[PDB]
Every structure is written in structure tokens, then in C-alpha cells.
Nucleic acid binder design. Structure first.
Lengths: 125, 204, 152, 80, 99, 105, 110, 100
RNA sequence: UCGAUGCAACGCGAAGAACCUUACCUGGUCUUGACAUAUCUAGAAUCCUGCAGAGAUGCGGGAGUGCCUUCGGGAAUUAGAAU
RNA sequence: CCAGGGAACUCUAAGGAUACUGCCAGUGACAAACUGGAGGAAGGCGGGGACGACGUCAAGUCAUCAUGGCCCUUACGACCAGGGCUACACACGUGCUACAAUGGUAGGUACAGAGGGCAGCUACACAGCGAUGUGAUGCGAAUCUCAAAAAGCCUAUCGUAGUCCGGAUUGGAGUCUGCAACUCGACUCCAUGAAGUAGGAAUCGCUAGUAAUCGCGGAUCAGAAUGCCGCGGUGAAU
């Protein structure tokens, strides 16, 4: 029952880890049924398969907020935190891939006199 | 070019001079009547030396706190001039509001009183740099860690206007925890308007 | 930027072949941030060439064509005494792959096939044997690089 | 244009003028500044003087003018 | 179960008023479920600072509206007879549902 | 090559248009690489504390391939402002043209 | 085939080809095809002459290019000879529905 | 703004206040589906016959101090020009500078 | 209508012109005046009306007689008498 | 909020902890400092914003406001109706929408943040092709609602055509707001279907959650955003 919280952009995934078969329940639905994008499909399994144990734990994941790849990143971070909660010696191998560092990147606010965060209105010369 | 010293410090080391809560419909009425109170009372108490006034209000009544350096002239003999203004304050405001007078222990540390004294001398045709130096000397001896006074306009009556400032001490404007009093008044001279800005820095 | 060597970002390998080279090509094809879209065109073209040539390793085949495409010598614009003569230098390894990928994408962008997947598949097939606009542009670069061959 | 349930908009003063002109069938123009008023079948035939902003322009209400506002037949900008 | 909802613009005055309201009940022999902070209303304004031109010259203002709310578990008479005497106004609005 | 002649706070007359066009075509005779010209004729003050002497303004923003040179001239009379502006613009055209021609050697 | 005096394309679907009659768009084509029996996905070439006549009779209820062109021209002519504001814009070839006649009036001016 | 415009707004709002209730009852009468057709048409005619300034659409709210018709904010009742001065002086409670 | 005029004017004032806003134009109107104080003549203000007019306005009819001090009368109020 | 009524977790919003070149290895004048490494969520200014020195441009604003002087006082003041600021041989500056197949259309199926709601938002039902209309409900809101996020994913079709692209213009019929939609409103429906097939010289923005693209809010506001100010989704190349 090792639980970890992961966050990314705007999503916040709460994942529960138990030693089991490998049943991943993403917000009440299976991983492949919940994630229609294969890019977001890899990210969830990335930490589990990094240390060669994909079909070794039952995962109860509840994502909330964020998009479809932000949620995958949040789930990956939460699984990473739960895995290091289970074992501290997991961290040395699971840190070299950057799975435990929270990604602090966020939508930069629209600044005034600008079209976007950085985009500037044009002026012909 | 320069932000307002109190406005940029309102939430860090300072405090608003209005402390009432109003629903979005009530905010307009409260703020408009509050501004009207401020203007009327500042025109009425021109002779006295009144600094910042805090018009804070509970539900119903209000508690208007005026800080001054002339409590005798403000209050009147046995409270005969404070109550005469009390009746008008209630007559134009809402539910009867209690006005209480506080005392400024050091009138040379209040940026508003110094600025208004400079303005009065300028309107009475005192030499402008004489007034600047007098104010800087008084405030810097009255314990202030720094003063800066700025005069802008047709100084002495010159056709070409100019800005003359005088600093003594620190007055670190770009530091937020500076406790910098600021005031900007105008002297109505026979050749136009002189802008009198005063910054007084007194700690952390 | 007249400053330090700012570190390059970490690319994430694509899910199917798990290759950073295919991920980089997917980024090259992708426009407007439609990574899933570009994934689908890249995968369709790679599967089409794999089926047509009956080759088990599409990633190995793609690596072969990429290495066959990327140039070896480029020409730059030098300046000595207000003069502009082109100097042939050796392309840096990081720039080699990017130049090859960009040439492949921009050559497949102007094919007559219906879908971009078909156009990319045709361009990949041509480049594997040494034909197409990608090889034409690379040989036109080598033509300049060898027709100068005098300014160091 | 206008909700059908609300009916046509006729200005009260011009309505009174045209109603009191219909009982006489008089031909002198009805000088009005109300150019937003609906042209009704009752007012077919006679002539109004619709203000164009500067002066009044006569408008002899023909059959194919009901369905139109008064100001449509009084151009405001004069461009040569 | 009386319910007090506190609204203000200051995030310290509201906390201290809520603490006083909690303290009277917690010290007059009663139980209180703590002041949960309900979402603030943050409303922003774009006041361009020049009198005439330079629309890019702006001042961005904001007026936060903080809201707290406290429930008592059981309203003992000695605890409840204090709220109408706990006159804390002039900065914080207090609404007592008394339901 | 474009020629725009706008007037701020003054009514540009046919004589002003001719007095700017004749000098513009004179500079464009020796320099044939001009992209655009924009001349603003203004009346920037009333000379309330100096009695004119800078009451009228004539400014020229010209754009060439790879550069943009702006000149201005204040004067009591608009025609003299135009002539002084034109002379500054001609001198700057000559300066740029000779630098570009001497960059080849 | 040939409906309403025009030879609509027969290599495309019926609901798309029927839009080639001046006076029939896509919603009207859908309504026409649902009026009798025809699925919109069927090509004109596969349409039988019995349902050709069915569709031809169905189109007659809609004011098509024979009557429609004359009706539109008459509607414009009414305003033009009326002299109203819209008529004036019609005879002067300027936008009539309150659009910019200062910079963007090109699909009108030429 | 001009004193004439300030007083013109005042007298334009006076009629709105005077005919506020009559307009409410009349609008309910015209919108009632149980009312007779001629009744609702006559009520609509009376609405159109009411004085022009009585409608709250001719009202243009402006700054309380300066009477500025532009840059108005409903929450404060002030134009942008006076609102900025008051906010920077601190006279507007709760309002401060924004940065996020 | 006016202002903004190289970068640093030109989706800028204007965070929003059908009327209003509105500053411009045509026409119809008023002159201490739409708004403040000096004043003395009547009246609680205020509400509902009729006609004429595009409306601004003009000419007429009904209900009400405030409040505190009380026979000097006063915070407001409608139409001027003039500087 | 939901792990097992619970007081765990997410979240909300007040007070704090952390980060300091603190430690290690080097280079460096026995220095400041620099380069790399460990631990850590974050490493050296962690990302972003507010904060704009003395002065410059007689820069802008007397039309927010105030103000010296000058000028008009049956008028340059004031009230009202109608028109006008929306005109068009034209040029220029900012944008939006496209020119398509990395796409159009029709079916399903997901994933947000932020903000607004009595000067209102509307569950739901019925009528309507629709804009909307009638009845009625919950909500001064973490309660009810705006509101469905769109790009995305699956299937079918279109098969390179001025077209099943594009959606200007115009004709007809309507809905709302408003005393009033002619000048001169926004939306809805039917019909038409314009230029446009990637744009000369020249020229602009952007170094990372950025550019690009996709939707959603607000201020002003009775109605009237392709502007402005914001919000998140996908997300590069160098």
C-alpha cells in the first residue's frame, strides 16, 4: 500500500502500489483504455520497466487536472515516488533517468503589451 | 517614471487608510462616499495640519481616524469644533460616524505636513531653495534617517520651468521594507503651480 | 550567443521502436505541436517501406538511409577584408543528422503521392538507394564544397 | 430587423399625423423627422417629407414601399 | 449548529477574526470544527497609467476576497451567548446562518 | 521606391507636395537603391516662449535595403524646414552610398 | 445525369452532385434525397431512371436556377427602380449590408 | 467632463428613477401571455409613448469625481485616471498591485 | 469632432459612436442660465392630468399643507428681481 | 476529498522549512571567482512578475483632473430632434480567416485551468432545422450555473479538384437587445459561392513549457470583439 503523489503541469496523480500481477487502474479504467496516445502510454510504464519489473505490482492511479501527456507525466512521477517509498535503494537507479525530479515547467503567463508570454506584435520596417 | 512609494508598499510594510469590506454592489457606493468624505474634510481642515486620515468603517457606523499636529484647533474648546464637523460628517455620510483625533508626535517626520509647509511658504512668496533647505534641515535633525524634497515648476516665476531636488540621508526608494513616507502637494503661486514632493525615510 | 555552451534538451524516445533518432525525426515532421499526428505519419511511412522492402528492422533501415544521406563537408560564409568567399569546413556530427532529417522532410514535402505518409515512404525508399531530392540537395552541397576546395 | 411578435414600430406623432391625413386624403406633404417609423399599408399613396439630417426630402409612398423604414428613401450622405 | 462565514480583503485580519471566533467557543466549553479556508475570489484590473496614450503602459491591480467558515459541534447556551457580544466588524463581514 | 508625404497639425498644400517631391527625386537620381520615403510635415509647437524659430518641423524616415536613416529639421518656416531636411537626407544618402561603395575594395 | 436542365457530375455522391444546381445547397440536397428514398452516399451513376425521375420531380418544389435567377434579379431590380438606399448601393456597386466602404470592399469594387 | 454633461446625466437618471416602477409593471404586462392581445399592444404603445430619457439605455455611467465617460469600472465607480491615483494613495481598500 | 505622428503615432485615448455617449453638422429654442453663494416675495416638497409640437418647451385644471421651534421663524423646495 | 462514515490522500488557504557556493575535487594572486560532482523537488540569478537611477527627447497629455495668461458672455455658454464620427478612385499600419489530405465532413469516445453569475447564471420539460420562446428549478455561490473545452483518439467518406477547400458578397425568411436595428447591431436558417492554389523587393517575432497551434473566460457592456487583459491543452527546431 505504498502511495505516492506525482505532479506535472496541472495534473496531480495519486498512485497506490501493491505487490501483485500488474493490473494498472488509471482513474477506474485500464491504462490502454484511458490513454489513447501511445506517447502517454509509455510514460506510465517507464519507471516500472526501467528497473525490470513491469508485471510485479498492482497500481491504483487517480489522476485529476491537466491534459493527456501532463497526466501521464504526473502518473510517472507518482509511481516513482511510490517506488522509492517501497525501497530506498530504488532511488539511486531511478534518479539517473530524472523520474523523481518534479518538472516545475509551467505555462508562462501572458504579459502585458505582448500577444503571448514572449510573442511581440510586429512592426514593419 | 517612478511608482508611488506607498502604493508599491501597501501590502509589504504598510497599511491602507481604508479598512471596510463591501459587496461588489456596495463597493462603488462606499468608495464614492469615502472619497467625498476625504475631499470635503481635507478642504475643511486646510488651516489645521492634518496628515493621513484612515476612514475605516464597520457595518452601519464608521470610525474616521484623523491624525494631526493641531489637536486643539481641530477639536475646539471642550469638543465644540469636533462635534460641529461630526454633524456634517453624519449628514453627508451614512449612519452616524465617530471621528477620533490622533496626535503626530514629530510633525517633521510626516511627509504630508512638511510638504504642505513648503507649499504654504511658496504661496507666501518665500525663496524656493530657502524653503527646501529649511525643510531638509528640520527633518534631518528631527531623527529622520533621510529626506528628499523636490520642487517642480516656474520656481520664482521663471518662464522656463525646472525641477530642483534636495536629498540628505538614505531614502532608499527601491527597497520595499523602507518605511518611506511620501507626499505630493501643490503650491498655488501667482505664476502657476509648484509641485512639492517629499520623501522621508525612517527605518525598516 | 556570445556566452556559454547552453545544454541541449533531452529527447524522449518514440514508443514503437524506442529510438531517439525516430523521435527526432518525428519532431522534425511535427508542426503546430501535433506530435501524435507526426507519429502517425512517420509510423505509416516506416511501415510502408518495411512492408514493401520486406525488411524486419525499420529502425535499422532508417539508420542506414540517414547515414547515407547526411553530408560530410559543407560551405560557410567567411569574411576577410570585406570579402565573401565560401570556406569548405567539416559539418559537426550533431548538425549532420539534423541537416539530413530536414532534407528528408523537405524533400518528401514536395512529392506527388496522396498522403504525407506515402510521400515520406517514397522519399525514404529513394534515399536508401541514393536517389530523390534529398540526395540531389546533398550532392549539390558537396558540389559547392568540392568546387571551392581552395579556401582551407 | 424586429421581432414579429412585437409588430411594426410606428412613431406615435407620425401615426397621428397620417391617421388624420387619411380621413381627408390630402396631398400636402407630412413633414416628419421620424425616419425610423414603419411604412404601413394605411399610408400608401400620400406624401411625407422625411428629414435627411439637413433638409426634408419628399417621399410619395407607393405600393412597393410597405415593408421598409421611412429613412430608406432619404439618403443622408451626399457623395458625387 | 450555528455557522459563521467570514469575508474580508485582508488575509491576516480574517485569520485573526476567525481565531477569536474559534477561541470564544473553544474557551466557553464547546467543540468547534476548525476554520476551513474557502477559495478566494481574486479579481484583477488593467488600469492604463498614462492620461492619453501608451496602452502598453498599464497598472495591474488585484483585490482579493478571502473567506473562512467555522461550524460549532454543539451550541451550548454559555458558548452561544457570546457571539452577538463579540463585536468584530470594520474589516471583516460575519454571516451567522444559525441553522 | 515609395514616397509618402503626411502632414501633422498642418494642411499640406500642392506647393508643399512639389517642394518635397522635387528634392526627393533629386536624391533618388543619385541613389537608385532607396526602398521607401516617409516625410511628415508638422507644426510641433506655437513658439509661446521663444517666438517660433522651431515652430514647424519636417522629418524624413527613409528605408534602404538593410538600413533605415531618419532626419529631422525644426525651423520657423516650413519651406526652410523642408530644405534643411532635404539637405540632411541628401548628405546621409551620400554617406551611406560611399560607405557601401568603399566596402568592396 | 441531367436535373433541372444542367448536367450534374455523376462520378460523385448524389448529395454532393445535387449542389451543382443553382438553388440547391447541401441541406437542400439532403432533404431532397431523404424525401424519396435515396441514400446520400450513392453515386449519380448508379441511380436508376425511376429514381432519376423521382429526384427530378422532387427538385421542382424548390425554386431553382430557372425561377431563382429571375426572382433574385427581380428582387434587386425592385430596389434599383425604387431608389431606396439598398437600391442605390446596388446601382453603384458598393456594399449594402453595412460593411466597410473605406478599405475592405474589394469583393464588390473589383 | 463638462458641468453641462454632468447635470445632463443627473437629469437623465432622474427620469429613470421616476419611471422605474411603471416600466417594471408595464414590461410584465406586455410579456404576460395571459393578457389580451389588444391589452399588451396598448401597453406597448404606452411604453413607446413614455418620455425618451426614462429608458435606462440612454444612461452612460461615468466617473463620480471627473465625469469621465470612458475607462469606467463598475466595482469602484471611478474612471481609470482617478482610480489609479486613489489606489496608489491606498484609499481603495483591499486593492493593491498585481504580480503573479 | 478632437487628440496621438521615426523607433517610442497608426486594434493608440476609445475597457466597446443606432439614440445617449458626442465634443461635429442642419434646424428648432433659453439667457444669472443645466450647475454654486449673496437676496426678498408665496408655497411642504411631491404626485396625477389635458391639449400643441419632432422634442426642447408653451398654455391650462385637481389632491396634499411638511417637521422642529411656535408667532423672528430654520437644514430642502418650485416659478424671478437684479447686480 | 474517498485509502480503509472516515480525518488517510488530493484540494483549498494562512503560518513556516529548504538553497546558503552549505559539502567534495580541481583551476585561480595563499583572493574574488570559475569548472565539474554528490545529496536534494529545486544549484549557483531555480522559472516568471512588480520594482524603471541622474538625466534625454521644449517627447505626450490644458480633452480625465488641477492650473498662469489670453479669449467668448441673447454666446465659443445651454436644451432638444434628425444626421455624422460607419463616407470611398486610393495608400499605409496592425490583425483575423483561408488557399487544404499533417486536411474538409458525419458518427461516436476522452483529458483542463482560470474567471463570471440579482445591472444575473440558469438544472429540467415542452415548441422550434436553428438563433431562441414559454413554464419551472437551484444558486449571492468549493453548494446551483455559465459549460459543452477544442486540438486529440476510432470508423466511414472525400482522392488533388478552385474541389465535399475556402466562406467574401448578395437575395429571401427570422430571433433577441433596446423608445427605436434605414443610415448603422449581433446572431439563426435557406440560397449564391468571390478572390485565394502559399505570395516581388523588402521586412518581423521567438532561446523552453518558449515559438507554433487549440480551445475557454473577463473588463467595457441593454445589445455590439477578429481588439485588449487573462487561462489552461498539445508542444518543437536551433
Amino acid at each position: 500500500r505504498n502511495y505516492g503523489t506525482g505532479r506535472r503541469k496541472t495534473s496531480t496523480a495519486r498512485v497506490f502500489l501493491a505487490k501483485g500481477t500488474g493490473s494498472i487502474v488509471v482513474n477506474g479504467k485500464p491504462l490502454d483504455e484511458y490513454f489513447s496516445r501511445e506517447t502517454s502510454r509509455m510514460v506510465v510504464r517507464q519507471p516500472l520497466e526501467l528497473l525490470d519489473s513491469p508485471t510485479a505490482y498492482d497500481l491504483y492511479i487517480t489522476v485529476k487536472g491537466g491534459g493527456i501527456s501532463g497526466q501521464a507525466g504526473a502518473i510517472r512521477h507518482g509511481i516513482t515516488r511510490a517506488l522509492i517509498e517501497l525501497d530506498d535503494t530504488n532511488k539511486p537507479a531511478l534518479k539517473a533517468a530524472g523520474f523523481v525530479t518534479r518538472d516545475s515547467r509551467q505555462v508562462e503567463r501572458k504579459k502585458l503589451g505582448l500577444r503571448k508570454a514572449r510573442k511581440r506584435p510586429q512592426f514593419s520596417k | 517614471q517612478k511608482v508611488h512609494p506607498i502604493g508599491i508598499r501597501l501590502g509589504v510594510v504598510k497599511k491602507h487608510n481604508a479598512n471596510w469590506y463591501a459587496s461588489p454592489k456596495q463597493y462603488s457606493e462606499y468608495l464614492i462616499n469615502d472619497i467625498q468624505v476625504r475631499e470635503y474634510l481635507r478642504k475643511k481642515l486646510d488651516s489645521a495640519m492634518i496628515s493621513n486620515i484612515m476612514i475605516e468603517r464597520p457595518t452601519g457606523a464608521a470610525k474616521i481616524t484623523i491624525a494631526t499636529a493641531r489637536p486643539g484647533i481641530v477639536i475646539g474648546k471642550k469638543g465644540e469644533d469636533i462635534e460641529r464637523l461630526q454633524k456634517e460628517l453624519t449628514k453627508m455620510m451614512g449612519v452616524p460616524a465617530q471621528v477620533n483625533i490622533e496626535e503626530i508626535t514629530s510633525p517633521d517626520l510626516d511627509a504630508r505636513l512638511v510638504a504642505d509647509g513648503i507649499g504654504s511658504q511658496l504661496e507666501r512668496r518665500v525663496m524656493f531653495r530657502r524653503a527646501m533647505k529649511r525643510a531638509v534641515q528640520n527633518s534631518m535633525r528631527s531623527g529622520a534617517k533621510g529626506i528628499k524634497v523636490e520642487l517642480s515648476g516656474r520656481l520664482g516665476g521663471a518662464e522656463i520651468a525646472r525641477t530642483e531636488w534636495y536629498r540628505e540621508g538614505r531614502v532608499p526608494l527601491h527597497t520595499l521594507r523602507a518605511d518611506i513616507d511620501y507626499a505630493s502637494v501643490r503650491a498655488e503661486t501667482t505664476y502657476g503651480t509648484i509641485g512639492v514632493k517629499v520623501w522621508i525615510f525612517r527605518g525598516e | 550567443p556570445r556566452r556559454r555552451v547552453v545544454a541541449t534538451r533531452e529527447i524522449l524516445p518514440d514508443p514503437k521502436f524506442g529510438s531517439q533518432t525516430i523521435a527526432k525525426f518525428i519532431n522534425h515532421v511535427m508542426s503546430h505541436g501535433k506530435k501524435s499526428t507526426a507519429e502517425r505519419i512517420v509510423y505509416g511511412a516506416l511501415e510502408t517501406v518495411a512492408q514493401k522492402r520486406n525488411i524486419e528492422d525499420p529502425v535499422a533501415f532508417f539508420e542506414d538511409v540517414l547515414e547515407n544521406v547526411r553530408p560530410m563537408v559543407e560551405v560557410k560564409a567567411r569574411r576577410v577584408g570585406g570579402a565573401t568567399y565560401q570556406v569548405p569546413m567539416e559539418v559537426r556530427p550533431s548538425r549532420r543528422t539534423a541537416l539530413a532529417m530536414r532534407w528528408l522532410a523537405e524533400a518528401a514535402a514536395k512529392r506527388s503521392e496522396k498522403s504525407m505518409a506515402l510521400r515520406l515512404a517514397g522519399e525514404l525508399s529513394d534515399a536508401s538507394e541514393g536517389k530523390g531530392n534529398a540526395m540531389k540537395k546533398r550532392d549539390e552541397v558537396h558540389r559547392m564544397a568540392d568546387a571551392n576546395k581552395a579556401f582551407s | 430587423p424586429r421581432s414579429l411578435k412585437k409588430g411594426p414600430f410606428i412613431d406615435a406623432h407620425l401615426f397621428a399625423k397620417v391617421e388624420n391625413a387619411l380621413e381627408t386624403n390630402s396631398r400636402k406633404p407630412i413633414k416628419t423627422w421620424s425616419r425610423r417609423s414603419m411604412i404601413l399599408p394605411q399610408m400608401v399613396g400620400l406624401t411625407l417629407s422625411v428629414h435627411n439630417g439637413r433638409t426634408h426630402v419628399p417621399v410619395i409612398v407607393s405600393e412597393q414601399m410597405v415593408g421598409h423604414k421611412l429613412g430608406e428613401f432619404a439618403p443622408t450622405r451626399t457623395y458625387r | 449548529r450555528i455557522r459563521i462565514r467570514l469575508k474580508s480583503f485582508d488575509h491576516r485580519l480574517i485569520d485573526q477574526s476567525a481565531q477569536e471566533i474559534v477561541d470564544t467557543a473553544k474557551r466557553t466549553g464547546a467543540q468547534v470544527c476548525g476554520p476551513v479556508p474557502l477559495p478566494t475570489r481574486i479579481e484583477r484590473f488593467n488600469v492604463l497609467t498614462s492620461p492619453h496614450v501608451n496602452k502598453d503602459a498599464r497598472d495591474q491591480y488585484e483585490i482579493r476576497t478571502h473567506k473562512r467558515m467555522v461550524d460549532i459541534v454543539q451550541p451550548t447556551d454559555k458558548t452561544v451567548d457570546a457571539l452577538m457580544k463579540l463585536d468584530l466588524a470594520a474589516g471583516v463581514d460575519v454571516q451567522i446562518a444559525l441553522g | 521606391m515609395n514616397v509618402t508625404i503626411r502632414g501633422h497639425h498642418i494642411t499640406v498644400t500642392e506647393a508643399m507636395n512639389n517642394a518635397v517631391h522635387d528634392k526627393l527625386t533629386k536624391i533618388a537620381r543619385h541613389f537608385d537603391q532607396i526602398q521607401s520615403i516617409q516625410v511628415i510635415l508638422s507644426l510641433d509647437n506655437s513658439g509661446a516662449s521663444d517666438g517660433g524659430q522651431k515652430s514647424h518641423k519636417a522629418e524624413a524616415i527613409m528605408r534602404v535595403s538593410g538600413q533605415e536613416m531618419f532626419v529631422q529639421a525644426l525651423e520657423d518656416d516650413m519651406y526652410k524646414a523642408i530644405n534643411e531636411m532635404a539637405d540632411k537626407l541628401d548628405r546621409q544618402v551620400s554617406k551611406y552610398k560611399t560607405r557601401l561603395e568603399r566596402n568592396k575594395v | 445525369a441531367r436535373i433541372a436542365g444542367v448536367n450534374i457530375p455523376d462520378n460523385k455522391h448524389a448529395v454532393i452532385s445535387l449542389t451543382y444546381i443553382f438553388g440547391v445547397g447541401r441541406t437542400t440536397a439532403q432533404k431532397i434525397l431523404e424525401a424519396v428514398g435515396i441514400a446520400p452516399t450513392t453515386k449519380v451513376s448508379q441511380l436508376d431512371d425511376i429514381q432519376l425521375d423521382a429526384i427530378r420531380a422532387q427538385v421542382a418544389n424548390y425554386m431553382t436556377e430557372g425561377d431563382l435567377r429571375r426572382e433574385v434579379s427581380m428582387n434587386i431590380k425592385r430596389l434599383v427602380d425604387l431608389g431606396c438606399y439598398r437600391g442605390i448601393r446596388h446601382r453603384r456597386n458598393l456594399p449594402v449590408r453595412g460593411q466597410n466602404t473605406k478599405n475592405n470592399a474589394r469583393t464588390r469594387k473589383g | 467632463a463638462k458641468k453641462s454633461m454632468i447635470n445632463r446625466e443627473l437629469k437623465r437618471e432622474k427620469e429613470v428613477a421616476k419611471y422605474a416602477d411603471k416600466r417594471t409593471k408595464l414590461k410584465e404586462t406586455i410579456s404576460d401571455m395571459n393578457a389580451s392581445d389588444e391589452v399588451r399592444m396598448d401597453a406597448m404603445l404606452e411604453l413607446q409613448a413614455l418620455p425618451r430619457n426614462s429608458s435606462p439605455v440612454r444612461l452612460r455611467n461615468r466617473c463620480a469625481i471627473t465625469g469621465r465617460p470612458h475607462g469606467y469600472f463598475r466595482k469602484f465607480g471611478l474612471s481609470r485616471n482617478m482610480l489609479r491615483e486613489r489606489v496608489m494613495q491606498g484609499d481603495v481598500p483591499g486593492v493593491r498591485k498585481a504580480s503573479w
